[PDB]
Symmetry: D2
Subunit: 293 residues, 4 copies
């Protein structure tokens, strides 16, 4: 089976000014991740891809383009979670039919679902698609917080391979590895890669890897090698780029940085501000010149 | 044009065991609201409706069935908000074409949208539909808390009539009324109806009105006439049933209570637990005898 | 036991520039509350008195001075709560010896105490002093939320008379009046008096009553009589005043307003900013011109 | 001026049944830390010492006792923070008069103090004593969170040496080390020692070091040498011990663990539960058997 460890970019999507997918531009983002960032894989349809603002047909279109463009050069994970469990099932089947290596699904949100509800939801996607699953935690956006016992119950399904941990609880992180050493863990906070890698994470799924893949791989590998002083430096420079990107607007700044690489990363999708201001464009141009040139 | 003040039930939906809509059962729920609960109107497609777990096609069907069953008997408000602004526009246009009296929209959620992205979302839905808009505030599910200055900005659009205040900040409630005396406020917490009415709210949109509609109108109408003592006792009795409903599980219990009336309110839609256990059914029946017989 | 229902000012204390107690100014604040604000009682040693920034001796001094000036002209409640239980027993005993009518105590804070620890704390102050107790709930400062079952445990001690409800949950508020109809509730949020009174609170303990006691009384009295329109208008003006007080600096503005009545309300105690800026003093004078002249 | 890097046990205090200090047992906790735990220092008067439950004189006695027992064998840091700045200055001078190597002070709590108020409070303690200061950050108890720009203001006083980072934000800890590379950082969460040491903290101040000081030093030193796999193994076993401790009652379990080494660690001080139950006593025994034998 395909190896899911390593560096995964959470794929960003190029949109036209009217909010439609810019396929050509999406293809240039995938090619940049594979050829330049040298990621081990892509995590498609996640929050970074502006996924929760799209229709079911557009999600399928994004899955088709990413698999068509990446082919078998890298690993591919498909994020198909939704508040609509039938939608999640139908997406999961589609990505399974396309050949994605594994599914992933955000905790169902909005409503306050009980834990048994959350487990039934994972079990149903798995059962209905026949594919392996990566639980996707992102407490800051869903408000859902899972504890060690709850990961154990999800892990009773043997097709659940592990978790995309976009959480800053390093105590929980450590406990997960202690209690389920065979389950994988992908760090989801790019600004906390080093500390996460010192606790044995198996890889990382990140939005800033779209532009900072080289450094990200460097932190990861240097940490895994015990080369902590060197890793910290690169995390320091990374975190200065990250800090500028968060202050200037995450999605637009990563898109403007890609444009400066000649990738037609296009606009954001509304209700997110679709166009950068002059100030955002000048600031990206300064981030490029300081950290990515 | 039609008056939107008064008592609106937040319409629950009947589902079949496989998740599909039970059109006959749904029709019965509407008929129960109109004929026995004597609501002034229905609020269709809100959270109570299990709306964010469905496809756009299923939300359109629910809107077609309510309009066709209720006719012009009562006021109809169509909640069409979503993380997908294109979907909000499409639903918005469909509800406007169906003849609903007004639209409503939840603040866009999941992503941390800025205020102006939120305002631009409301202005876009109005601009594509030409209908009046009710801002739907539900901080406990969204994580979005707007303040007086933000409500004023939203209220620059004249199509914005007011807000479904599903919040318990009674200082803010008072300030909205003092600041925008001509804008409407619907109370959203059924168990807090009297305190909200004492500050001048113009009506209430609630899920417990599907079964406790006679009592809700009395708290409201007695509070408005200053008969606070009588009002409080009815709110006392009402809160006993609400505490019962909440402890037994809100969606299923209101549906089971609907069944006890002769209404095929059905199952809940998955990822919510679709079937009531035997304990849940028994408790529904005790709530029936005690409070609604 | 003297009647404790009605309007109570949470007493502010006057401090000299060096942080010591200005006895003379303290007497003038007390005289202003009894004579001009026409309060039913004083709640001495609370949050508003700047109590938690003071030594055990200074707390005793304030209880001496308040009892000497008020004598038996009004009811006196003594807030003796602390993270230190020996200190709360010591203060409770001194205030009981001076003749305070009732004791009050904030839930022990800082550390996360269990509910049995909180209950043992109240029972210990009561058993050591022999006085009646008002449970002082203030979630915004303490982080402690208690429910109906816990209040019932607290109410197994018959010397606990009820709760200073400084919290915004109007559902919990209703439930408490319903479950424990003979226990008293004093509202703690001045800007939500009206809705609290509609739920049958028995009185109110508030910091703004040191300057706005005339209106405070009217809202409570008009609300309990069913004269809601009059009440609501007086709540609307009170809330304009309170919004300006809150925006200008709660503690300093009230003392600045007191000084415009000829009361030497003095400075705030450090770590709190001790002197009003020229802008704060100017805003106080505007508030006084518009709402208190 | 003496070196403050390294492993610091947040000293636990031995109380008698009646809550008074048991000086003999306090001396044995000190000799165990210095002689068997091999710490570099003690952090006296922190939360772990049950400090905010005591009187000023009792705070002074513990300062007197620990200095007198430790002498100049190890570094000593005196936590003197309080909501009473006057007390904080008085304890600060006393600790300075006894020869403590540095002071430390929790951000004033309970009231919602402003940043400039927080800064003025540390600058006053520094000015009145002439001692250096370690800013004590514990957001989960105080609710005070401070950012990069706030540390920068605090760091404008040269006598501020750094921070007792009792927080889980690893992005903020990376940014702190990047922005103020010469200011010290001590990790406050024992169970997150390793990831904290991977980001370059200069030492750790911890309550579990009273009994697990040998492993705590190994994790630190191993991580600083980039021996991540051994570090992790030892963090894992440490975290099973801490998990059991947290689950049984942190305060009573460390004392019971102490008593199983023949240290008379005594009772907790009330309002905390003073006596361990038979179940808490049997589980400490199991914890000693599995991890400290």
């Amino acid at each position: 089976m395909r190896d899911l460890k390593g560096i995964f970019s959470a794929l960003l999507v190029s949109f036209n000014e009217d909010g439609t997918i810019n396929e050509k531009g999406l293809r240039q983002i995938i090619r940049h991740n594979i050829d330049k960032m040298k990621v081990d894989g892509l995590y498609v349809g996640g929050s970074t891809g502006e996924n929760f603002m799209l229709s079911t047909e557009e999600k399928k279109e994004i899955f088709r383009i990413a698999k068509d463009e990446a082919k078998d050069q890298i690993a591919l994970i498909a994020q198909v979670g939704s508040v609509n469990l039938k939608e999640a099932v139908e997406l999961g089947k589609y990505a399974t039919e396309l050949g994605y290596d594994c599914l992933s699904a955000v905790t169902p949100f909005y409503y306050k679902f009980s834990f048994p509800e959350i487990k039934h939801y994972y079990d149903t996607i798995i059962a209905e698609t026949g594919s392996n699953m990566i639980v996707y935690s992102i407490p800051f956006l869903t408000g859902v917080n899972m504890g060690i016992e709850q990961f154990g119950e999800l892990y009773k399904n043997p097709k659940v391979l592990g978790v995309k941990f976009t959480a800053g609880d390093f105590y929980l992180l450590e406990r997960l590895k202690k209690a389920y050493p065979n389950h994988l863990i992908w760090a989801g906070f790019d600004e906390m890669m080093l500390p996460a890698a010192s606790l044995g994470v198996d890889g990382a799924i990140g939005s800033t890897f779209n532009v900072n893949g080289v450094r990200a791989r460097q932190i990861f590998e240097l940490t895994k090698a015990g080369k902590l002083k060197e890793a910290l430096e690169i995390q320091h420079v990374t975190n200065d780029l990250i800090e500028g990107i968060l202050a200037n607007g995450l999605y637009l700044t990563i898109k403007e940085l890609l444009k400066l690489e000649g990738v037609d990363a296009g606009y954001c999708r509304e209700p997110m501000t679709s166009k950068a201001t002059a100030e955002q464009v000048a600031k990206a141009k300064d981030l490029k010149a300081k950290f990515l040139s």
